[PDB]
Amino acid sequence: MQRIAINGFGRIGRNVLRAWFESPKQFHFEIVAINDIADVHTLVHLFKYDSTHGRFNGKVDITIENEKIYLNIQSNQRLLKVEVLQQKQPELLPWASLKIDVVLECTGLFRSHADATRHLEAGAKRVIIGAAPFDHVDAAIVYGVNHADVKATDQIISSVSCTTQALVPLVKIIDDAFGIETALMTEIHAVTADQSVLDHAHRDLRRARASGQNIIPTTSSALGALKRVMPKMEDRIDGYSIRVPTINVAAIDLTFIAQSPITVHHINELLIKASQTDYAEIMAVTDEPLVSSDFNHSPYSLIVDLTQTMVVGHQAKVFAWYDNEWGYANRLLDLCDSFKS
Amino acid sequence: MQRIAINGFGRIGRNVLRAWFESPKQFHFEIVAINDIADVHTLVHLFKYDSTHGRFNGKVDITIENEKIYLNIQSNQRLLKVEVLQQKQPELLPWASLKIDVVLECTGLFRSHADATRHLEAGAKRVIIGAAPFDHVDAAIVYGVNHADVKATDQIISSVSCTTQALVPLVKIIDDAFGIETALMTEIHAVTADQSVLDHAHRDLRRARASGQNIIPTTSSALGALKRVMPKMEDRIDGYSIRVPTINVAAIDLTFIAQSPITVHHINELLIKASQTDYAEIMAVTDEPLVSSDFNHSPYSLIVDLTQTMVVGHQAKVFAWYDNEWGYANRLLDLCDSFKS
Amino acid sequence: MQRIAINGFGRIGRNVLRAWFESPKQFHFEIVAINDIADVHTLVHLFKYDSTHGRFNGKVDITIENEKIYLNIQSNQRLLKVEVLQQKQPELLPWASLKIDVVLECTGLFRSHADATRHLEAGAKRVIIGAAPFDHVDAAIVYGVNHADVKATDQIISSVSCTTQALVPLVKIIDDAFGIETALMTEIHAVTADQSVLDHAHRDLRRARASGQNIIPTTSSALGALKRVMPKMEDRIDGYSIRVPTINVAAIDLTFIAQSPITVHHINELLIKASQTDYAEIMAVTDEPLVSSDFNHSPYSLIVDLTQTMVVGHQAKVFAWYDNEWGYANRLLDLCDSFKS
Amino acid sequence: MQRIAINGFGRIGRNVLRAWFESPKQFHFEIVAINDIADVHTLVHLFKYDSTHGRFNGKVDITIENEKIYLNIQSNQRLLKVEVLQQKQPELLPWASLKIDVVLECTGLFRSHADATRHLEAGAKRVIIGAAPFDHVDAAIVYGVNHADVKATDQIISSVSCTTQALVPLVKIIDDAFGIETALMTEIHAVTADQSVLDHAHRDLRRARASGQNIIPTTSSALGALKRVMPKMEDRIDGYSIRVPTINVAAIDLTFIAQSPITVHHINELLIKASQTDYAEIMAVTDEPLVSSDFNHSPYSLIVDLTQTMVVGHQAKVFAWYDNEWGYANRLLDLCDSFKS
Ligand SMILES: NC(=O)c1ccc[n+]([C@@H]2O[C@H](COP(=O)([O-])OP(=O)(O)OC[C@H]3O[C@@H](n4cnc5c(N)ncnc54)[C@H](O)[C@@H]3O)[C@@H](O)[C@H]2O)c1
Ligand SMILES: NC(=O)c1ccc[n+]([C@@H]2O[C@H](COP(=O)([O-])OP(=O)(O)OC[C@H]3O[C@@H](n4cnc5c(N)ncnc54)[C@H](O)[C@@H]3O)[C@@H](O)[C@H]2O)c1
Ligand SMILES: NC(=O)c1ccc[n+]([C@@H]2O[C@H](COP(=O)([O-])OP(=O)(O)OC[C@H]3O[C@@H](n4cnc5c(N)ncnc54)[C@H](O)[C@@H]3O)[C@@H](O)[C@H]2O)c1
Ligand SMILES: NC(=O)c1ccc[n+]([C@@H]2O[C@H](COP(=O)([O-])OP(=O)(O)OC[C@H]3O[C@@H](n4cnc5c(N)ncnc54)[C@H](O)[C@@H]3O)[C@@H](O)[C@H]2O)c1
């Protein structure tokens, strides 16, 4: 077993661990540690109880061996003993002792090549930044598109954002088949934890406004990040995110100019075949009249609504839902199960 | 005296009546009657207290002259005596005696020429259908664009949807300045009164879902309507509407292909100018990072977000807000004021 | 084995049928028919997809025959053939042909003895009204309290409201143990299906207001119902309800005067003992810091929050959560199962 | 001219400034400075644009004079020139230089006697803490009850909370007429700035949960505070609070044992009388069926719902609304204006 550590037990950190247990197939690695700036009792409480994902179907038992605090978790006929830490500064983590092979960096606070490496300076072999890269990176991966393009010499990988992981395959698939000249992306997204309950000072003057009562248009790391995966799309794609007051799940609305003839039928049939072949693992298509709440806890990177496809002359639009928490947390798992074979 | 009546004291019908009193200028016509299938006290209560636009600044007192009911409404140094009625069957209404010059159909249930004529058989002389056209109509009017081409012979007239009232000005202005090859619309709309609170049976399986907790991509009457008003744009444009849980205000994401050189600046500059020159009583533009609730009670048909503008090659995206309720309600008064000229 | 039918396939009716399959306990009766005013297609979609409780872990297949429409539902290793009907007039329903032993009236439209007998005319042997009695009932029942006092001759029963199911055991337990001079109830309830999305005509001028954006004080059926169940308490307990914009789950704030010595411990300890002994069936207690989301999909009639328990002098206050849909649906099955052996 | 300064330009700070300009009666004193840890541009935007209360009706202009930042604000035919600051440490502020007669402390952090003194040792003459007292104070004041009891020796004063200012009149008005043996409070409150948007680590584990999706019981400084104001109520009152997913406006449900015969009529007449006579400035009473968003922007410390009063036995309950932002903000101004002569 490879040994994995999560730094930052937030919406992502925590759902990774849930996903470890909830998965239909046992992952061939173990999660052996978690860090956060909060205490264990809080961490365990938010792990157990989730406004978004429900009560956790299993048992968590805190034990104290030595000074080392450990969670004994059990669910889906599977066990894990995890060490709980409360270190603010990553360079001071015990990754060497615990022998951590990969660190899922899920704090938002350590996106640089410099901060990433601090975990390596603390004994870790590899790191995965769970976010768009800030600066330099050894690699920018979207599981199902370029996970095979990881070299073993790669220490600072990025798994990008959820948005990027829905977006990239749509573009890959279509550019490849019909040719995309340019494209523009509207993302309609559930409220995220960085927003404000009420009008409160914030870096973003948009995201300063009450989360629960506003439509809030804003920036998306997705575009800058998608261009580190496909540099050819520089100057050829742009877009933005809209925040609305639902708790979870998002939609991506992508408008593009095709270089060959295109029909609704042809566009939809392409995406279906990909869902059944190369992109089986991460993509699915639906012709059913669903809404956001229907895709909660869905492990796919994207579910395409084929009813929503529109073509006019050479311009086309497609639409796809993703569970921005669940989908992405399963892609972090799937990515670690790839490094070993 | 121009005499107007409102059939359906709804979100629209009540906001029309308020708008009469709240306008800067006094309109050269009077509202003299309203009809709803609800009782008077319910109508008065809802008229006085609004979850969205606030309390009515004024007095409303019920008097029962003859065997008729009247409302005595004093506000903004103005007074009206409005007769209240309760007749589900539009032809049974006394439009003959009251000398109704124009009826505003705000029920939602009577949009066919056939159905709307029932007001003319009641003695009314003209009918503005406050909605998109079901079958045929003598005219289809977006105030500020084609309000002038209404005829004396015209009797059944449509003010279209609010979406349509914001989309047309944009398309007119851009097709005229740059050439639109094709375009596509995403409308992000607040909840509406036809939707459902929890999951409940409904003719549309999408709006059937819980309004408060869902993103609900649905359809827009706003495109069929725009093809009426601008027939030369047939087949150049399509779109769809998303419902999201805020109480009020909507936006449009318009994504078009341009037939000549375009830049973010030159787009934004054309819009600003157009607002200042030809389209001033219905169009504004803002430079600031605002959100939906900043447009509550805005009378404009559309406010353009200058920051939200984007160009990649020949493709471009512009973005406009509007108060779906209040915006539209001012265009109904604005339209009526154009007949007595 | 007994044959059950559901008139009205909404929040309750649909959760009745699911709870039947999801129940870890198999029930000894079968549900063989349902009726609503919407088409099978709408009914299936809504059964399969739910904003509150999620997707159904099962398969639904429609069987259209010469005239009859059936549903073949398979879940949790159980199967059911359910005839689907569309009759707004309960007297005409084929309850004879189908041999319906019990009907559940989850429509909220047939609460009188008069109207509930319309089922008895159509061939049914017994009706349970899924609401508070309106005029006369052969019995008002709270499962876990007086479920044993159902005489086999009783043809028209009532299973009161979700709120009554919780209030009664709380009062029973406390009045028996300490003695209630008087009590006052505050219910804080998620939004219900009868409320309005936006401000719209309604019978109640409070429930006419936009559900999503408003605290809404309102009345409770539960007090009338409680007097029918525990008649000695006439005039000793009043109360009211408050709707807030959550999707599901209610709470109950009972404030009472005690006739003997009360302390926080002594109250909680008794409530614990009940949850363990007499009422381990339908009652649970937590010390943990939970919120509404945590009781979503809990089948208990009431979960007491012991930390919220408070005493000053002779007055005290206790707090209980319940899943207003799921608890109430489970108590209907629980009830139907009690008419056996 | 008294000179006032605001520390913490939040929901209270901003609403305090706004309310200065909106008041019918000019205040015979002036706000001359604000301090927040945020950039002036953020503070100005957030002041101008408000999800809860609207656009500011007036013009704000920034000037940079002698390396000093100022705000020139014009509205309601009034002008204020206000210096903006950014000192996290209160001992460092220039209160002496500006000759500040009263600091308003709206940060939430500096509530201990020793903290609040940092403003005094920084040059200010008096300080009002805009929250319940943390440890001790020179005086805890509710405008309209004990406002005339302030001494010249009271330099650190508490203006308590939104909640306390509604509760103290109710408790006092009734205790005086009828006698209160004991009382228990339930407060239903809108979301506060300090809550979390999604489940996120937090000191309080109830307030850690998603604000827009939960009912969340919590604690209320209002009783500690009311005991400081009415020492005789020690051991005679208690309560707790509930956050629900609305943006603004709270209500208070108060249940008490009377020591004298009570009826509904007699309670409502006493409160109507008090609203008309001694509590006229802070209290009001409505007989209408209204909901939360109707009391938005109301300046009153409380508004009894005459319709909501209930009595059974010696025990009774009364219900009152208050705009938790706007109400309190006026009481700060009203209390500053009571320092004259
Ligand atoms: N939320 C999504 O849907 C989503 C999708 C894709 C990417 N991401 C990215 O994932 C990252 C995590 O976001 P999240 O949703 O988990 O939010 P979150 O704020 O809930 O998670 C942050 C967590 O890190 C903890 N933390 C803060 N400082 C720390 C430190 N110095 N050391 C250790 N722990 C620390 C916080 O207490 C919290 O538990 C962000 O970069 C976000 O942009 C999020
Ligand atoms: N609300 C918007 O944002 C908006 C914008 C543009 C256009 N519209 C159109 O305006 C119409 C009204 O929508 P709304 O939002 O006001 O909905 P609403 O439900 O609030 O208004 C409908 C009103 O009609 C009344 N009514 C029902 N049957 C009637 C009958 N037989 N005779 C008379 N009155 C009757 C209802 O009681 C209600 O007051 C719809 O057709 C809609 O397409 C609405
Ligand atoms: N939801 C709760 O928390 C709760 C709890 C306890 C009891 N109740 C009561 O249960 C009943 C149902 O309420 P609900 O929450 O399920 O609401 P709902 O509106 O979803 O249920 C009503 C259902 O009955 C259908 N219906 C309408 N007319 C009909 C007819 N003539 N014949 C047959 N079916 C018809 C509707 O189409 C709908 O599916 C009411 O009496 C309600 O007050 C509700
Ligand atoms: N909002 C209400 O309903 C209400 C009612 C009564 C009392 N209060 C009290 O008011 C206080 C503030 O609440 P709020 O609603 O203004 O919340 P808020 O979060 O909007 O206020 C905090 C503000 O102070 C600023 N700030 C933080 N640290 C600072 C520092 N060191 N120096 C200067 N400025 C700093 C923040 O950047 C922000 O602008 C709390 O104590 C709360 O109990 C609020």
PDB file of C-alpha atoms in Angstrom, chain C residues 3-130:
ATOM      1  CA  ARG C   3     -54.206  -4.485   0.513  1.00  0.00           C
ATOM      2  CA  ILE C   4     -53.429  -0.752   0.816  1.00  0.00           C
ATOM      3  CA  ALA C   5     -54.179   2.166  -1.510  1.00  0.00           C
ATOM      4  CA  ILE C   6     -52.877   5.741  -1.553  1.00  0.00           C
ATOM      5  CA  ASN C   7     -55.099   8.625  -2.658  1.00  0.00           C
ATOM      6  CA  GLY C   8     -52.752  11.528  -3.400  1.00  0.00           C
ATOM      7  CA  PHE C   9     -49.172  10.880  -4.469  1.00  0.00           C
ATOM      8  CA  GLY C  10     -47.331  13.959  -3.254  1.00  0.00           C
ATOM      9  CA  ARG C  11     -44.847  14.630  -0.476  1.00  0.00           C
ATOM     10  CA  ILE C  12     -46.496  12.086   1.813  1.00  0.00           C
ATOM     11  CA  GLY C  13     -47.939   9.512  -0.611  1.00  0.00           C
ATOM     12  CA  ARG C  14     -44.658   9.260  -2.497  1.00  0.00           C
ATOM     13  CA  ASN C  15     -42.589   8.949   0.697  1.00  0.00           C
ATOM     14  CA  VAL C  16     -45.111   6.358   1.970  1.00  0.00           C
ATOM     15  CA  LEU C  17     -44.300   4.124  -0.984  1.00  0.00           C
ATOM     16  CA  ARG C  18     -40.530   4.623  -0.740  1.00  0.00           C
ATOM     17  CA  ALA C  19     -40.454   4.012   3.000  1.00  0.00           C
ATOM     18  CA  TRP C  20     -42.180   0.680   2.309  1.00  0.00           C
ATOM     19  CA  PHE C  21     -39.170  -0.508   0.254  1.00  0.00           C
ATOM     20  CA  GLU C  22     -36.429   1.248   2.226  1.00  0.00           C
ATOM     21  CA  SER C  23     -37.682   0.008   5.613  1.00  0.00           C
ATOM     22  CA  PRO C  24     -35.163  -2.525   7.048  1.00  0.00           C
ATOM     23  CA  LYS C  25     -38.298  -4.279   8.363  1.00  0.00           C
ATOM     24  CA  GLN C  26     -40.400  -5.862   5.638  1.00  0.00           C
ATOM     25  CA  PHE C  27     -44.082  -5.071   6.138  1.00  0.00           C
ATOM     26  CA  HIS C  28     -46.778  -7.740   6.153  1.00  0.00           C
ATOM     27  CA  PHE C  29     -49.145  -5.819   3.863  1.00  0.00           C
ATOM     28  CA  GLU C  30     -48.864  -4.641   0.251  1.00  0.00           C
ATOM     29  CA  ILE C  31     -49.631  -1.344  -1.506  1.00  0.00           C
ATOM     30  CA  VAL C  32     -51.547  -2.210  -4.655  1.00  0.00           C
ATOM     31  CA  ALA C  33     -52.842   1.062  -6.054  1.00  0.00           C
ATOM     32  CA  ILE C  34     -52.305   4.831  -6.107  1.00  0.00           C
ATOM     33  CA  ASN C  35     -54.245   7.780  -7.451  1.00  0.00           C
ATOM     34  CA  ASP C  36     -53.493  11.418  -8.310  1.00  0.00           C
ATOM     35  CA  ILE C  37     -54.692  13.941 -10.881  1.00  0.00           C
ATOM     36  CA  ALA C  38     -51.470  13.818 -12.896  1.00  0.00           C
ATOM     37  CA  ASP C  39     -50.401  11.319 -15.565  1.00  0.00           C
ATOM     38  CA  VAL C  40     -48.354   8.243 -14.773  1.00  0.00           C
ATOM     39  CA  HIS C  41     -45.338   9.833 -16.541  1.00  0.00           C
ATOM     40  CA  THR C  42     -45.201  12.799 -14.154  1.00  0.00           C
ATOM     41  CA  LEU C  43     -45.824  10.477 -11.206  1.00  0.00           C
ATOM     42  CA  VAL C  44     -42.927   8.155 -12.025  1.00  0.00           C
ATOM     43  CA  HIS C  45     -40.385  10.922 -12.669  1.00  0.00           C
ATOM     44  CA  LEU C  46     -41.221  12.549  -9.357  1.00  0.00           C
ATOM     45  CA  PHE C  47     -41.072   9.205  -7.522  1.00  0.00           C
ATOM     46  CA  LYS C  48     -37.633   8.516  -9.023  1.00  0.00           C
ATOM     47  CA  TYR C  49     -36.189  12.021  -8.556  1.00  0.00           C
ATOM     48  CA  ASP C  50     -36.596  14.054  -5.368  1.00  0.00           C
ATOM     49  CA  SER C  51     -34.940  17.267  -4.201  1.00  0.00           C
ATOM     50  CA  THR C  52     -35.292  16.340  -0.513  1.00  0.00           C
ATOM     51  CA  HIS C  53     -34.671  12.574  -0.261  1.00  0.00           C
ATOM     52  CA  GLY C  54     -32.772  11.860  -3.518  1.00  0.00           C
ATOM     53  CA  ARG C  55     -33.066   9.240  -6.283  1.00  0.00           C
ATOM     54  CA  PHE C  56     -34.854   5.932  -5.711  1.00  0.00           C
ATOM     55  CA  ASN C  57     -32.551   2.902  -5.449  1.00  0.00           C
ATOM     56  CA  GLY C  58     -34.886   0.797  -7.620  1.00  0.00           C
ATOM     57  CA  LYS C  59     -36.469   0.249 -11.029  1.00  0.00           C
ATOM     58  CA  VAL C  60     -39.871   1.522 -12.091  1.00  0.00           C
ATOM     59  CA  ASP C  61     -41.471   0.017 -15.176  1.00  0.00           C
ATOM     60  CA  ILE C  62     -44.864   1.107 -16.531  1.00  0.00           C
ATOM     61  CA  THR C  63     -47.233  -1.591 -17.807  1.00  0.00           C
ATOM     62  CA  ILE C  64     -50.065  -0.258 -19.946  1.00  0.00           C
ATOM     63  CA  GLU C  65     -52.769  -2.863 -20.522  1.00  0.00           C
ATOM     64  CA  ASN C  66     -56.051  -2.810 -22.417  1.00  0.00           C
ATOM     65  CA  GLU C  67     -57.219  -0.122 -19.987  1.00  0.00           C
ATOM     66  CA  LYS C  68     -55.273  -0.555 -16.708  1.00  0.00           C
ATOM     67  CA  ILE C  69     -51.938   1.182 -16.000  1.00  0.00           C
ATOM     68  CA  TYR C  70     -49.604  -0.562 -13.545  1.00  0.00           C
ATOM     69  CA  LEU C  71     -46.165   0.108 -12.082  1.00  0.00           C
ATOM     70  CA  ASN C  72     -43.615  -2.627 -11.451  1.00  0.00           C
ATOM     71  CA  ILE C  73     -41.305  -1.323  -8.752  1.00  0.00           C
ATOM     72  CA  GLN C  74     -38.317  -3.386  -7.536  1.00  0.00           C
ATOM     73  CA  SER C  75     -36.054  -2.267  -4.644  1.00  0.00           C
ATOM     74  CA  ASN C  76     -34.209  -3.591  -1.551  1.00  0.00           C
ATOM     75  CA  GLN C  77     -35.041  -7.120  -2.787  1.00  0.00           C
ATOM     76  CA  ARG C  78     -38.819  -6.477  -2.828  1.00  0.00           C
ATOM     77  CA  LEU C  79     -41.351  -6.112  -5.668  1.00  0.00           C
ATOM     78  CA  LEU C  80     -44.797  -4.506  -6.077  1.00  0.00           C
ATOM     79  CA  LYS C  81     -47.460  -4.265  -8.779  1.00  0.00           C
ATOM     80  CA  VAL C  82     -49.259  -0.935  -8.250  1.00  0.00           C
ATOM     81  CA  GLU C  83     -52.311   0.115 -10.274  1.00  0.00           C
ATOM     82  CA  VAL C  84     -52.242   3.836 -11.164  1.00  0.00           C
ATOM     83  CA  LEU C  85     -55.472   5.797 -11.415  1.00  0.00           C
ATOM     84  CA  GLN C  86     -56.514   9.370 -12.202  1.00  0.00           C
ATOM     85  CA  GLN C  87     -59.873  10.023 -10.501  1.00  0.00           C
ATOM     86  CA  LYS C  88     -60.529  13.345  -8.726  1.00  0.00           C
ATOM     87  CA  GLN C  89     -63.813  11.999  -7.277  1.00  0.00           C
ATOM     88  CA  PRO C  90     -62.880   9.302  -4.699  1.00  0.00           C
ATOM     89  CA  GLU C  91     -66.357   7.740  -4.856  1.00  0.00           C
ATOM     90  CA  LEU C  92     -65.633   6.429  -8.374  1.00  0.00           C
ATOM     91  CA  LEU C  93     -62.340   4.712  -7.558  1.00  0.00           C
ATOM     92  CA  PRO C  94     -62.444   0.898  -8.086  1.00  0.00           C
ATOM     93  CA  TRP C  95     -61.614   0.055  -4.466  1.00  0.00           C
ATOM     94  CA  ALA C  96     -63.931  -2.966  -4.669  1.00  0.00           C
ATOM     95  CA  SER C  97     -62.301  -4.675  -7.677  1.00  0.00           C
ATOM     96  CA  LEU C  98     -58.869  -4.086  -6.090  1.00  0.00           C
ATOM     97  CA  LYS C  99     -60.099  -5.240  -2.649  1.00  0.00           C
ATOM     98  CA  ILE C 100     -58.608  -2.304  -0.700  1.00  0.00           C
ATOM     99  CA  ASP C 101     -58.530  -3.054   3.019  1.00  0.00           C
ATOM    100  CA  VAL C 102     -57.154   0.402   3.966  1.00  0.00           C
ATOM    101  CA  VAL C 103     -56.927   3.706   2.062  1.00  0.00           C
ATOM    102  CA  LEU C 104     -54.498   6.500   2.970  1.00  0.00           C
ATOM    103  CA  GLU C 105     -55.845   9.963   2.252  1.00  0.00           C
ATOM    104  CA  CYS C 106     -52.706  12.016   1.580  1.00  0.00           C
ATOM    105  CA  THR C 107     -54.478  14.609  -0.520  1.00  0.00           C
ATOM    106  CA  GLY C 108     -55.433  17.118   2.190  1.00  0.00           C
ATOM    107  CA  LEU C 109     -58.821  17.638   0.448  1.00  0.00           C
ATOM    108  CA  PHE C 110     -60.962  14.983   2.166  1.00  0.00           C
ATOM    109  CA  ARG C 111     -60.738  15.529   5.913  1.00  0.00           C
ATOM    110  CA  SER C 112     -64.410  15.411   6.888  1.00  0.00           C
ATOM    111  CA  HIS C 113     -66.276  12.200   7.788  1.00  0.00           C
ATOM    112  CA  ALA C 114     -68.437  13.078   4.804  1.00  0.00           C
ATOM    113  CA  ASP C 115     -65.621  12.971   2.274  1.00  0.00           C
ATOM    114  CA  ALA C 116     -63.622  10.123   3.771  1.00  0.00           C
ATOM    115  CA  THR C 117     -66.742   7.934   3.511  1.00  0.00           C
ATOM    116  CA  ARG C 118     -66.580   8.443  -0.267  1.00  0.00           C
ATOM    117  CA  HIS C 119     -63.765   5.900  -0.236  1.00  0.00           C
ATOM    118  CA  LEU C 120     -65.896   3.540   1.867  1.00  0.00           C
ATOM    119  CA  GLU C 121     -68.566   3.870  -0.807  1.00  0.00           C
ATOM    120  CA  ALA C 122     -66.089   2.960  -3.555  1.00  0.00           C
ATOM    121  CA  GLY C 123     -65.460  -0.366  -1.762  1.00  0.00           C
ATOM    122  CA  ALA C 124     -62.742   0.396   0.811  1.00  0.00           C
ATOM    123  CA  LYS C 125     -63.038  -1.209   4.259  1.00  0.00           C
ATOM    124  CA  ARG C 126     -61.211   1.537   6.155  1.00  0.00           C
ATOM    125  CA  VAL C 127     -59.796   5.020   5.586  1.00  0.00           C
ATOM    126  CA  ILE C 128     -56.913   6.684   7.396  1.00  0.00           C
ATOM    127  CA  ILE C 129     -56.877  10.448   6.987  1.00  0.00           C
ATOM    128  CA  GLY C 130     -53.285  11.709   6.697  1.00  0.00           C
TER     129      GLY C 130
END
